[PDB]
RNA sequence: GGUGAAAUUCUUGGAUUUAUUGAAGACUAACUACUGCGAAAGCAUUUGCCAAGGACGUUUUCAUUAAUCAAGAACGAAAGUUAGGGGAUCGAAGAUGAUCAGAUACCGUCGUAGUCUUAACCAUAAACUAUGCCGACUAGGGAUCGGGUGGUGUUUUUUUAAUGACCCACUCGGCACCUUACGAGAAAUCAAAGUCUUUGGGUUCUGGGGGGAGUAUGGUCGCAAGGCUGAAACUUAAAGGAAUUG
């Protein structure tokens, strides 16, 4: 029984702050609250608290990451750059 | 006048009548 | 009405080719609607060939011509290059001459 | 009131080993003063002369060669392989309509540890008696020919440096081995190496560099 | 026999460059462009101007070290006309007919594997 | 491939899924090949590897998560190790493995 | 009061039997239980600390020292990092591009830590309300809120007073101005809405 | 440097030219064609991976399962929009040098947005073959792309082959051209635009003089720009198509 047409989680701010701020905030809220797959044990138990800190419900691993999301676009394109340059020092 | 410009003419002409009307909304 | 069966030029069963820029006026233009003239001409010319070997090392040397493909825009192809204009009948003939 | 010509130091360029004339040409630098001598300053310049000019024969009229100057002694400065090009006229001739172009390239390491990227080119030929006016390959042919050209070229390198690779290149040893394996696929024609470039040199090694000299 | 330089005649429109350098290229020997030897600004590229500049360049070349030269003729290149200017011919002529040697000359014009959108806009330069 | 072989073992043969029951098989020597999923922790990996050379059991390191090793064996739950008790029709024991 | 997480990292003490705990700034992707390698001869992986001289150009590195051994200076805020754009082995240097866009040359012994700092993207989310900012500076310093010096009286501000709110004289102030004068755009070499890409050359 | 010609502009800051190296983003020249593929948009560097497709071959399988389609839905050039990145090039805007009676332009210069990419919108192009789809029938010809079949064919040498590339004949299924016109059309032309007053194979859609006007209004979709749907009053004897001669 779909409760709201658009606002979603952002319907807590009501009419305040204006639509384009709620749009922007909703996107990053949906990002930060959602449960994420755990690289190490492979159950999707990774949740945030304290921006940049993502830990797992069980197996209790904690990963440092983006403020509102686990892996940030730049972090990845750095992850591959470090792959690359390291292989230069190997082969 | 070029059909394309004649079209842009009334495109504008409509957005303005759109305006004035909403001032009475 | 319709003045050509090839429409502009030479496109059937594609719907999009890709444009090239005209050598003369830079106007973009479809590759198969363009008009291409291979420019193959010796580096030197009529005159300088005799005075070339005369001032040159090596027997007769080599003489390496330069090859570059030309792309014209119609309106630029019309202004100079292969055009003239043809009669209603003479248009059909694709013979190069 | 200057005319640097009335200052300039002069010089003559000497070439490496497996070639015809180790003498090449002349140059100009500056006097070797205290503070900016003529020696370490430039030297390592690069000169490009057709090898038909340095092999003397006209069956080599194309195929420019890049030499790089490493060491200097006493108004005599030698040089080493920096690359190989083609003449623009030859290529621009070679690419004719009505046929299929084929290219390919690979990066590979030699014995003396120069790394290089070599190129290749080929063109589908009509074989005599063929009545169709174009003669194009099957694009599965194109992938195959590239594959063999690849495996062939990765073998000819890693032989003894460019010392042997230049010695391999000069009488086009690769061109026929290509033509050999290829004809089981498609006839082609031309088939040259067309380019090679030097992207990583190992190190000076005055002991090795002097091996082309005497 | 001779002592070899390298020519590199850049002939564009509205000017023509003739300057010989050392066979390694890093070192000059004179220059004298095609604008120098006349002043109308509209005659900058013409053969008569290019001829004179070929004369002044062949002099200084033989006036220092160089009896012989290899030439690389050139056009604007890049995204531009790719077809040589008017005063590259008059230059080669008047520098070989000047009494200097010639050998093994090719075309160094930059030709891309095409890109970097040409100027003048999609509609072209319209006059 | 290796999962196409794995699916054969699954339908024609005997296997045990999970760390506890594949030590049962590794202790009894009832095990022939054991498959270790990519991400399973290195301590468990090293322990399963130590029981393995004690039973002379060959070990195959599956490149993929315990999530997919579970879909490799046709199950809807993740599995970090599989132990092959009886190879089925499949050739896994005598092939590249 | 800090936008990026910290990583408490534990090392043995080489000269005494004991554990010495250090506080790094957690680089993104670093995780609990990971092993961290600090040294000249250390491998290049996210989280390790290496002298700038020991990494190829393009390596991306955080918390990097200005002088060697200053225990880290540059690019510590959540999301930032420096890039190595080159080395000059004689008089050994390494050239880096800082987050500001600047280029700077430091000692090749100056240590970075591989990767980018965690917590990035924090500034993308709108504060949305006074309190969220309130609670922000409450853990930093007492900078908030901010009275416009144009809403004060003259005695209060260079911009103070008037029968309408207006600055009344150019708001660009000289570098050579004096304390109590500098309120405005200080030493501003241009002004107005920046049109066009910025991006140092 | 740039133009018909110039000027703005760049030059002890050695500009333009040269050499060596490096960086960035875009692009894929020539080969490239009356040639390929895709539902259309559209799609040209290499290689690996991922799934997909037509045509053909078929004494394999199922057995009417199909044709076309209001509603509804997938995709949909360029520009444009939201949020990051990127921002080499070219470049709406703007500013300039000229030209002009004027010159808000055409030409030259600077250059914002844009141009590229990710996530999401937008849903439009002369999105053109200005030509619905399925089926049948009606006429010649030489090329060509893909599949196949036939040959004591050619070229490849080795020792004959095997292959591969080629040649010749036939057959499907393509992209087109050529000549015909029985036939059609107002003509231009058209192997369909034919088998139509000798008017009926199946089906979808749109039009009913011009202007008003794709305007008003309502609904609906969109962040917006706008998209789909879409009148009337009034006006008017023409507007229009192809061909002919001037
Ligand atoms: Mg109002
Ligand atoms: Mg007309
Ligand atoms: Mg189209
Ligand atoms: Mg005109
Ligand atoms: Mg306060
Ligand atoms: Mg305030
Ligand atoms: Mg304020
Ligand atoms: Mg007050
Ligand atoms: Mg005061
Ligand atoms: Mg004041
Ligand atoms: Mg005031
Ligand atoms: Mg005010
Ligand atoms: Mg290409
Ligand atoms: Mg519909
Ligand atoms: Mg303007
Ligand atoms: Mg003006
Ligand atoms: Mg005019
Ligand atoms: Mg439409
Ligand atoms: Mg046969
Ligand atoms: Zn976990
Ligand atoms: Zn043109």
From Swiss-Prot, chain B:
Region of interest: Disordered: 1-25
Which cellular component appears as one GO term in the record?
cytosolic large ribosomal subunit
Q: What does this protein do?
A: Component of the ribosome, a large ribonucleoprotein complex responsible for the synthesis of proteins in the cell. The small ribosomal subunit (SSU) binds messenger RNAs (mRNAs) and translates the encoded message by selecting cognate aminoacyl-transfer RNA (tRNA) molecules. The large subunit (LSU) contains the ribosomal catalytic site termed the peptidyl transferase center (PTC), which catalyzes the formation of peptide bonds, thereby polymerizing the amino acids delivered by tRNAs into a polypeptide chain.
* More details: Present with 11900 molecules/cell in log phase SD medium.
**Pfam families cross-referenced by the UniProt entry:** Ribosomal_L41
Species annotation: Saccharomyces cerevisiae (strain ATCC 204508 / S288c)
Any idea what this protein is called?
Answer: Small ribosomal subunit protein eS32A
The molecular function terms of the Gene Ontology recorded here are:
structural constituent of ribosome
UniProt family annotation: Belongs to the eukaryotic ribosomal protein eS32 family.
Top-level taxon in the UniProt lineage: Eukaryota
One of the protein's GO biological processes? cytoplasmic translation
List the InterPro entries hit by this protein, alphabetically: Ribosomal_eS32
Q: Describe the subunit structure.
A: Component of the small ribosomal subunit (SSU). Mature yeast ribosomes consist of a small (40S) and a large (60S) subunit. The 40S small subunit contains 1 molecule of ribosomal RNA (18S rRNA) and 33 different proteins (encoded by 57 genes). The large 60S subunit contains 3 rRNA molecules (25S, 5.8S and 5S rRNA) and 46 different proteins (encoded by 81 genes).
UniProt-annotated location(s): Cytoplasm
Disulphide bridges: none
From Swiss-Prot, chain C:
Entry keywords, A to Z: Cytoplasm, Ribonucleoprotein, Ribosomal protein
GO cellular component terms given for this protein:
90S preribosome; cytosol; cytosolic small ribosomal subunit
Q: What is its main location?
A: cytoplasm
Where does the record say this protein resides? Cytoplasm
Q: Which GO terms describe its molecular function?
A: mRNA binding; structural constituent of ribosome
Q: Which residues form a coiled coil?
A: none
Q: Where is this region: Disordered?
A: 1-19
Q: Kindly indicate whether the keyword Protease belongs to this entry.
A: no
Q: What are the GO BP annotations of this UniProt entry?
A: cytoplasmic translation; maturation of LSU-rRNA from tricistronic rRNA transcript (SSU-rRNA, 5.8S rRNA, LSU-rRNA); ribosomal subunit export from nucleus; ribosome assembly
Q: Spell out the family assignment given in the record's similarity comment.
A: Belongs to the eukaryotic ribosomal protein eS26 family.
What is this protein for, i.e. what is its function? Answer: Component of the ribosome, a large ribonucleoprotein complex responsible for the synthesis of proteins in the cell. The small ribosomal subunit (SSU) binds messenger RNAs (mRNAs) and translates the encoded message by selecting cognate aminoacyl-transfer RNA (tRNA) molecules. The large subunit (LSU) contains the ribosomal catalytic site termed the peptidyl transferase center (PTC), which catalyzes the formation of peptide bonds, thereby polymerizing the amino acids delivered by tRNAs into a polypeptide chain.
Q: What else is known?
A: Present with 503000 molecules/cell in log phase SD medium. There are 2 genes for eS26 in yeast.
- Name of the protein in its database record: Small ribosomal subunit protein eS26B
Upper classification of the organism:
Eukaryota, Fungi, Dikarya, Ascomycota, Saccharomycotina
Task: Write the gene name.
Answer: RPS26B
Query: Which part of the full protein is shown?
Result: 2 to 98 of 119
Swiss-Prot record, chain E:
What ranges does the record give for the region Disordered, renumbered to this chain?
A: 107-127
Which InterPro entries does its entry note?
Ribosomal_uS11, Ribosomal_uS11_CS, Ribosomal_uS11_sf
| Claim: Membrane is one of the keywords in the record | no
The biased composition feature labelled Basic residues covers 118-127
Q: What keywords are annotated for this sequence in UniProt?
A: Cytoplasm, Nucleus, Ribonucleoprotein, Ribosomal protein, Ribosome biogenesis, rRNA processing
State the compartments where it is located.
Cytoplasm; Nucleus, Nucleolus
One Gene Ontology biological process: maturation of SSU-rRNA
Q: Name one GO cellular component term.
A: nucleolus
- Give GO terms: molecular function aspect only: RNA binding; small ribosomal subunit rRNA binding; structural constituent of ribosome
PROSITE patterns in the cross-refs? RIBOSOMAL_S11
Source species, domain of life: Eukaryota
Q: Which family does it belong to?
A: Belongs to the universal ribosomal protein uS11 family.
Q: Give the function comment from the record.
A: Component of the ribosome, a large ribonucleoprotein complex responsible for the synthesis of proteins in the cell. The small ribosomal subunit (SSU) binds messenger RNAs (mRNAs) and translates the encoded message by selecting cognate aminoacyl-transfer RNA (tRNA) molecules. The large subunit (LSU) contains the ribosomal catalytic site termed the peptidyl transferase center (PTC), which catalyzes the formation of peptide bonds, thereby polymerizing the amino acids delivered by tRNAs into a polypeptide chain.
Which HAMAP family does this entry report, sorted A to Z?
Ribosomal_uS11
Q: Other remarks?
A: Present with 3370 molecules/cell in log phase SD medium. There are 2 genes for uS11 in yeast.
| Protein name in the entry | Small ribosomal subunit protein uS11B
From the broadest rank down, the organism's phylogenetic lineage runs: Eukaryota, Fungi, Dikarya, Ascomycota, Saccharomycotina
Gene behind this protein:
RPS14B
From Swiss-Prot, chain G:
Similarity section: Belongs to the universal ribosomal protein uL2 family.
A molecular function GO annotation: structural constituent of ribosome
Q: How does it assemble?
A: Component of the large ribosomal subunit (LSU). Mature yeast ribosomes consist of a small (40S) and a large (60S) subunit. The 40S small subunit contains 1 molecule of ribosomal RNA (18S rRNA) and 33 different proteins (encoded by 57 genes). The large 60S subunit contains 3 rRNA molecules (25S, 5.8S and 5S rRNA) and 46 different proteins (encoded by 81 genes).
Give the gene symbol.
RPL2A
Task: Identify the keywords attached in UniProt to this record, alphabetized.
Answer: Cytoplasm, Isopeptide bond, Phosphoprotein, Ribonucleoprotein, Ribosomal protein, RNA-binding, rRNA-binding, Ubl conjugation
A GO cellular component entry from the record: cytosol
**Superkingdom of origin:** Eukaryota
* Intrachain disulfide bonds: none
Q: Where does it reside?
A: Cytoplasm
Q: What is its main location?
A: cytoplasm
Name of the protein described by the UniProt record? Large ribosomal subunit protein uL2A
Protein role? Component of the ribosome, a large ribonucleoprotein complex responsible for the synthesis of proteins in the cell. The small ribosomal subunit (SSU) binds messenger RNAs (mRNAs) and translates the encoded message by selecting cognate aminoacyl-transfer RNA (tRNA) molecules. The large subunit (LSU) contains the ribosomal catalytic site termed the peptidyl transferase center (PTC), which catalyzes the formation of peptide bonds, thereby polymerizing the amino acids delivered by tRNAs into a polypeptide chain.
Q: Any other comment in the entry?
A: There are 2 genes for uL2 in yeast.
Where are the Phosphoserine modifications? 43, 107-108, 197
The residues joined by the cross-link Glycyl lysine isopeptide (Lys-Gly) (interchain with G-Cter in ubiquitin) are 41, 67, 93
């Amino acid at each position: 029984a779909k409760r709201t047409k658009k606002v979603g989680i952002t319907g807590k701010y009501g009419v305040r702050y204006g639509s384009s701020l709620r749009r922007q905030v909703k996107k990053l809220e949906i990002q930060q609250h959602a449960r994420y797959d755990c690289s190490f044990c492979g159950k999707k138990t990774v949740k945030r608290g304290a921006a940049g800190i993502w830990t797992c419900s069980c197996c209790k691993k904690t990963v440092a990451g983006g403020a509102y999301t686990v892996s940030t676009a730049a972090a990845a394109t750095v992850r591959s750059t470090i792959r690359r340059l390291r292989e230069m020092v190997e082969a | 006048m070029r059909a394309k410009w004649r079209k842009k003419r009334t495109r504008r002409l409509k957005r303005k009548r759109r305006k004035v009307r909403a001032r009475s909304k | 009405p319709k003045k050509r069966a090839s429409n502009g030029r030479n496109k059937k069963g594609r719907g999009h080719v890709k444009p090239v820029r005209c050598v003369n006026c830079s106007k973009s233009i479809p590759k198969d609607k363009a008009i291409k003239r291979m420019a193959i001409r010796n580096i030197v010319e009529a005159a300088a060939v005799r005075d070339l070997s005369e001032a040159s090392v090596y027997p007769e040397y080599a003489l390496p011509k330069t090859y570059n493909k030309l792309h014209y825009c119609v309106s630029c192809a019309i202004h100079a290059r292969i055009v003239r204009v043809r009669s209603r009948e003479d248009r059909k003939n694709r013979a190069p001459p | 009131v200057v005319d640097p010509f009335t200052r300039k130091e002069w010089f003559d360029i000497k070439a490496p080993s497996t070639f015809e004339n180790r003498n090449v040409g002349k140059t100009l630098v500056n006097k070797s003063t205290g503070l900016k001598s003529a020696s370490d300053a430039l030297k390592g310049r690069v000169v490009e002369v057709c090898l038909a000019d340095l092999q003397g024969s006209e069956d080599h009229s194309f195929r420019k060669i890049k030499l790089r100057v490493d060491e200097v002694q006493g108004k005599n400065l030698l040089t080493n392989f920096h690359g190989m090009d083609f003449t623009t006229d030859k290529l621009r001739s070679m690419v004719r309509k009505w046929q299929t172009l084929i290219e390919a390239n690979v990066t590979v390491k030699t014995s003396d540890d120069y790394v290089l990227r070599i190129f290749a080119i080929a063109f589908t030929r009509k074989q005599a008696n063929q009545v169709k006016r174009h003669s194009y390959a099957q694009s599965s042919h194109i992938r195959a020919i590239r594959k063999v050209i690849s495996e062939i070229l990765t073998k000819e390198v890693q032989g003894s440096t460019l010392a042997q690779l230049t010695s391999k290149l000069i009488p086009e040893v690769i061109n026929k081995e290509i033509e050999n394996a290829t004809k089981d696929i498609f006839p082609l024609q031309n088939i040259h190496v067309r380019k090679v470039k030097l992207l990583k040199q190992p190190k000076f090694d005055v002991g090795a560099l002097m091996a082309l000299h005497g | 026999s001779q002592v070899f330089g390298v020519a590199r005649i850049y002939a564009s429109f509205n000017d023509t460059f003739v300057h010989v350098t050392d066979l390694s290229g890093k070192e000059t020997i004179a220059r004298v462009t095609g604008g120098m030897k006349v002043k109308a600004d509209r005659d900058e590229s013409s053969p008569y101007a290019a001829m004179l500049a070929a004369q002044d360049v062949a002099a200084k070349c033989k006036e220092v070290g160089i009896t012989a030269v290899h030439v690389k003729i050139r056009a604007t290149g890049g995204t531009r006309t790719k077809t040589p200017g008017p005063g590259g011919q008059a230059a080669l002529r008047a520098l070989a007919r000047s009494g200097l040697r010639i050998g093994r000359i090719e075309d160094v014009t930059p030709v891309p594997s095409d890109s970097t959108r040409k100027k003048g806009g999609r509609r072209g330069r319209r006059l | 491939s290796i999962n196409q072989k794995l699916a054969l073992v699954i339908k024609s043969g005997k296997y045990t899924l999970g760390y506890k029951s594949t030590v049962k098989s590794l202790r009894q020597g009832k095990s022939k090949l054991i498959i270790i999923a990519a991400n399973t922790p290195v301590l468990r990996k090293s322990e399963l590897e130590y029981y393995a050379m004690l039973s002379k059991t060959k070990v195959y390191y599956f490149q993929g998560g315990n999530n997919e090793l579970g879909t490799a064996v046709g199950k809807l739950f993740r599995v970090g190790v599989v132990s092959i008790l009886e190879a089925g029709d499949s050739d896994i024991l005598t092939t590249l493995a | 009061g800090r936008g990026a997480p910290l990583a408490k990292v534990v090392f043995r003490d080489p000269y005494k039997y004991r554990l010495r705990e250090e506080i790094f700034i957690a680089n993104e992707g670093v995780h609990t239980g990971q092993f961290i390698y600090a040294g000249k001869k250390a491998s290049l992986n996210v989280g390790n600390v290496l002298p700038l001289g020991s990494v190829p150009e393009g390596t991306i590195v955080s918390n990097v020292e200005e002088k060697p051994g200053d225990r880290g200076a540059l690019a510590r805020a959540s999301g930032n990092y420096v890039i190595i754009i080159g080395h000059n082995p004689d008089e050994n240097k390494t050239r880096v591009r800082l987050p500001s866009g600047a280029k700077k040359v430091i000692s090749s012994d100056a240590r970075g830590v591989i990767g980018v700092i965690a917590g990035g993207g924090r500034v993308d989310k709108p504060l949305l309300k006074a309190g969220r900012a309130f609670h922000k500076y409450r853990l930093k310093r007492n900078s908030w809120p901010k009275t416009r010096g144009v809403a004060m009286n003259p005695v209060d501000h260079p911009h103070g007073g008037g029968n309408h709110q207006h600055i009344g004289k150019a708001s660009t102030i000289s570098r050579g101005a004096v304390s109590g004068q500098k309120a405005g755009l200080i030493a501003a070499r241009r002004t107005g809405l920046l049109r066009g890409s910025q991006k140092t050359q």
